[PDB]
């Protein structure tokens, strides 16, 4: 029922996150150099070192807003996607379910500690 325990298996999980080969495409913000019409298509850029920046300053309140700017790294690379069978898109997809697998006991523990905090 520890309301603060989030936040290093938060940090634990990008560090296994930025030792996956499928995140070298979302480590650091696109440069608009090599891909100029992204900001056309995208509204709002993330990437994994702006996560675990807003994580570090303590600009996360909760999981869930760390959870919100992940899935917009994957939710950005399929709209920005030219195929379904892309390689950077296909990379995506299996650091999603890498993300998605690690987090959900991050999310659960949280709910739950913060029910106990209010019961
Ligand atoms: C040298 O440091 C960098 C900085 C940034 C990057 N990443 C990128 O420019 N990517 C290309 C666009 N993209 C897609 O989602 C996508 C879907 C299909 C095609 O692209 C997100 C990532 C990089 F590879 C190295």
Redesign the pocket.
């Given at each position: 029922y520890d309301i603060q325990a989030w936040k290093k298996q938060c940090e634990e999980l990008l560090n296994l996150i930025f030792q996956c080969e499928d995140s070298?495409?979302?480590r650091?913000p696109?440069?608009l150099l090599?891909?100029p019409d992204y900001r056309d298509i995208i509204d709002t850029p993330m990437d994994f070192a702006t996560v675990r920046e807003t994580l570090e300053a303590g600009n996360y309140e909760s999981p869930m807003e760390l959870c919100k700017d992940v899935r917009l790294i994957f939710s950005?690379?399929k709209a920005?996607?030219?195929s379904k069978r892309?390689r950077?898109?296909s990379m995506?997809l299996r650091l999603s379910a890498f993300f998605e697998e690690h987090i959900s006991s991050v999310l659960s523990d949280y709910k739950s500690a913060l029910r106990f905090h209010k019961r």
């Open positions: 070298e495409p979302f650091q696109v440069d090599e891909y950005n690379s920005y996607t030219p892309s950077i898109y995506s």
